[PDB]
């Protein structure tokens with residue numbers, strides 16, 4: 001039984017008497033004789049309670065909320081929201097101010113985006129702001145926080161027909177780690193809003209800190225981690241997990257990559273198992289067998305880290321390429337070619353930079369042209385300032401030099417950011433912080449950045465609401481929007497220990513979705529999406545001609561395949577864009593897939609038809625076979 005204030009607050013002489021008394025007092029959580037939807041402390045994207053205007057220039061007040069961050073001013077005078085508003089009006093460049101109900105003080109928040117300001121639920125304060133004017137045609141648009149049972153520390157799209165509908169995500173034995181043998185998964189149907197959780201135990205696998213690759217049949221191979229030698233295989237068909245063969249060498253914080261021939265290569269992962277650099281290894285799904293590749297030498301790919309070998313072989317930028325080759329774009333200052341021939345091979349490809357970029361963002365935005373875009377990262381895993389440097393790396397024949405062009409610096413240094421490639425081939429960078437500090441919100445960049453390789457120029461997007469630092473994720477949805485989620489997780493010694501001394505402020509058991517500009521016309525209305533009306537649900541093979549019916553476009557539409565995504569620790573080794581050429585005869589479109597499985601990696605892809613102005617369809621799922 002729960003009374004709900006005129007504003008929207010909810011509690012659990014009288015009883016509505018003290019309850020009324022409690023909602024007078026900014027210092028009252030309990031009373032003897034408060035239970036809102038989101039608890040005190042919770043981050044917000046919108047006022048949870050009823051807003052209020054206040055006046056020749058107007059402000060919107062959200063009660064029972066704080067703006068965390070560097071203040072430009074804190075003044076002990078003010079005793080009314082009115083007066084705090086009045087003071088924000090007389091302070092140059094004040095967009096955000098905070099009234100402290102308990103101490104009668106007005107804070108003016110400092111300037112954005114140089115400062116990072118966060119909107120928290122706290123009954124002790126109220127927030128005052130100057131109405132924002134975001135043109136979604138230029139800056140895209142964020143929806144509101146979607147709350148989740150598990151922090152999405154790792155996440156992947158489930159391959160389904162006609163288009164994927166579900167996002168699986170997962171943490172450790174707990175939803176907010178410690179060899180446990182359990183893994184808490186969340187399940188999010190974004191067709192419906194449906195959100196379930198489960199606990200995966202059959203595999204005897206805590207899948208925290210793993211390699212993730214999508215196989216030919218769209219099964220998801222989840223490798224090592226808290227259980228350093230254990231391997232689980234997720235079958236979309238079953239919606240079940242199966243044990244795979246133990247890896248040959250136990251690993252965590254490694255990258256795996258699906259190859260042209262549908263085997264999976266992994267190298268490094270010194271976080272768990274022995275604390276030593278880790279040589280390469282290849283999984284063959286047909287033989288269902290791991291093979292150790294000693295000549296896949298780890299030494300050439302090490303970073304130099306103040307914390308040592310524990311870190312230096314972590315989170316490798318691996319792309320599966322032509323004739324079963326592996327390109328390693330970083331994060332080591334030097335790029336290399338790795339292979340699975342003999343006892344495995346290694347050779348220098350190029351120098352990307354003068355310093356390492358651990359957990360920088362990387363994506364193959366243009367497979368047919370061998371084009372890779374890198375930005376951000378930091379020279380050491382933690383306690384190191386992030387770089388603004390970004391590069392286009394061009395790869396041709398395996399085991400011959402690569403070309404690196406430095407491009408425009410990002411507007412912000414980002415450590416632990418995420419990147420997705422979009423159907424137009426632009427790369428959207430999200431989250432990360434100015435100084436890589438594991439388990440912190442400190443100086444989280446909220447402003448997303450769109451990089452356009454056509455112009456080799458950056459564009460600052462609308463801000464998201466929650467800092468997406470360490471243990472955050474970015475993945476592409478079938479509607480060509482971007483999910484940004486997670487952040488946090490606590491070190492807990494034993495397994496089953498109760499999180500009471502952990503900092504819950506750094507946990508964000510939630511996500512938020514960004515509409516890029518391309519979903520909007522000049523007037524900020526949603527633009528008219530092509531419809532792929534008809535498509536064979538049939539497997540297709542490299543070199544084949546894909547045929548589909550596109551209704552709802554003014555002019556000749558373009559098309560592109562985006563491989564489905566897997567993501568954790570700023571590593572998405574499964575995403576890649578294959579641009580297609582379209583020949584239009586009627587409303588029936590046809591494209592000849594590339595001849596090379598090094599470009600068209602076996603697996604499930606999004607097909608997108610886009611308007612000539614660059615507005616993409618919802619995707620139809622497309623399965624490439626070997």
Ligand SMILES: *[C@@H]1O[C@H](CO)[C@@H](O)[C@H](O)[C@H]1NC(C)=O
Nearest residue numbers: 368369578579580581593594
């Ligand atoms: C598409 O067509 C152009 C001209 O033939 C070509 O340069 C491009 O690389 C082709 N293949 C693609 C884009 O898959």
Ligand SMILES: [Cu+2]
Nearest residue numbers: 209253471569
């Ligand atoms: Cu971690």
